[PDB]
Structure 1
Amino acid sequence: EPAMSMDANGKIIWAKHSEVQQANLKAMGDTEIKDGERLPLAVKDMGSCEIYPQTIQHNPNGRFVVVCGDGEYIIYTAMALRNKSFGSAQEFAWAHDSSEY
């Protein structure tokens, strides 16, 4: 998988593609179609991180994602495209509440 987490507005923001820069997040779409049939995306990257992740997890309200990669955790302020925060991991739990970790 890539690292992505989706806001229930309807944007799964992922980053990267497979090893592409993280530079590419977004997707609020704009339109509707049949179950079987297929759909269109928006285009407006944000990001161009360096650390290569393997986790994405949303904040409990989607909001703050903490992303880990290269073994450290960048958390983003997302809309912000701000680094919400960073450090090195080993293992994790968000305090589910959406306010601690």
Structure 2
Amino acid sequence: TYRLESTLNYGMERVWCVASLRGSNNVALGYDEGSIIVKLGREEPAMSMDANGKIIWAKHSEVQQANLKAMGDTEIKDGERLPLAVKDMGSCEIYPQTIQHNPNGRFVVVCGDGEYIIYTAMALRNKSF
């Protein structure tokens, strides 16, 4: 939407170049008075596993970022990574800064922008705010 995420100055000024790491989350920027290597955020995912087998994440595959979904009912061998095993989950209204299922499975919480919205475990109707 090209809306300003941040403006950064440093007391180095005149920023000539940019480049980005191809494996991602470091960008480095060349200035008149020096160079800086900078580290960008998001290093880790937000998700939670309840007891209903709705393990909910945001982003990823068979889930959108804006909406909320995910399920994981698979128990295949401990030695490898298990499939996504997602089942579809209803409405959301906010972005997931952190998105989490209830630890015993009755609530879902999506948190975002100074607000939390509560959606119901497997029905996803707005429970609470």
TM bin, normalised by shorter chain, reads 0.5 to 0.7
**Structure 2 stretches lacking a partner, 5+ long:** 1-43
| TM-score normalised by the chain length of structure 2 | 0.46
1:63 to 106, 109, 119: 106
Separation (CA, whole Å) in 2 of partners of 1:60 and 1:70 = 23
d(CA) in 2 for partners of 1:20 and 1:9? 18
Give the stretch that moved more between structures: 11-20 or 43-52. Answer: 11-20
Which structure's residues are more often strand, by fraction? 1
Shift in Å, 1:65? 2.6
Q: Shift of the alpha carbon at 1:69?
A: 0.8
Between 32-41 and 20-29, report the one with greater CA deviation. Answer: 20-29
Alpha-carbon distance in structure 1 between the residues aligned to 2:89 and 2:64: 10
Q: Judging changes above 3 Å, is the alpha-carbon distance between structure 1 residues 74 and 13 closer, same or farther for their aligned structure 2 residues?
A: same
Q: Matched residues, percent identical?
A: 100
| RCO higher in structure (CA 8 A, sep ≥6) | 1
| Alpha-carbon spacing, 1:32–1:62, altered in 2? closer, same or farther (3 Å) | closer
Q: Could you tell me whether the CA contact under 8 Å between 1:58 and 1:64 is conserved in 2?
A: yes
Show structure 1 runs of 5+ residues with no match: 87-101
Size of the aligned set, in residue pairs, is: 86
Inter-CA distance 54–29: structure 2 relative to 1 (3 Å threshold):
closer
**Mapped contact 1:24–1:44 kept (Cα < 8 A):** no
Distance 1:21 1:79, change over 3 A: same
What TM-score does the superposition give when structure 1 sets the normalisation length?
0.55
CA RMSD of aligned residues (A): 3.5
CA distance, structure 1, for counterparts of residue 64 and residue 96 of structure 2: 11
CA drift of 1:53 comes to 1.9
